[PDB]
């Protein structure tokens with residue numbers, strides 16, 4: 001599928017069916033997007049919403065979070081699991097307060113330098129909260145791309161990972177980047193699922209190679 005057709009079909013789908021009312025999509029800021037991305041990394045959206053609201057009420061700004069005792073952060077995290085996320089969350093808040101005056105930095109290198117924030121999370125923060133032109137690649141997004149373009153191989157191999165990042169850059173547009181990047185997460189979370197994807201509801205079904213061959217189980221590849 002031509003990349004300009006890929007992006008247009010995904011944005012047209014998002015306009016009518018996409019999620020736009022999650023709390024971290026209303027009056028968006030780099031802090032709110034960062035906080036939601038870290039909570040969502042290993043936890044389902046329904047579990048996250050009450051925690052996100054409790055964290056924003058107690059810590060309205062990243063400086064408030066930075067100045068709080070770590071034990072209070074860990075207490076409020078209880079039930080989200082994967083507490084390395086919370087330790088790094090607090091360290092990153094302290095880095096923003098100390099190096100950046102309490103305001104989130106707006107360059108890719110400074111955001112990726114934060115503890116707990118990798119290449120995809122940095123692009124997510126900058127594209128979704130400020131409209132900067134970066135693509136994303138988490139497991140949801142990688143599964144949509146690998147099925148549509150038939151990318152076999154284990155993404156734990158560098159050459160496969162690099163092919164998937166290049167494909168993501170290619171289909172991600174500049175105009176509407178915030179809509180496209182949320183739409184791709186929506187698609188991998190609710191439609192292009194690990195088992196038995198819902199191809200009839202997918203706006204890529206007219207050009208997807210896995211759908212044409214009923215071969216979604218091959219993409220992405222598994223660990224050997």
Ligand code: SF4
Pocket residue numbers: 144147148191192193197198199202203204205208209210211216
């Ligand atoms: S058509 Fe099916 S396999 Fe292809 S991207 Fe959409 S849901 Fe995934």
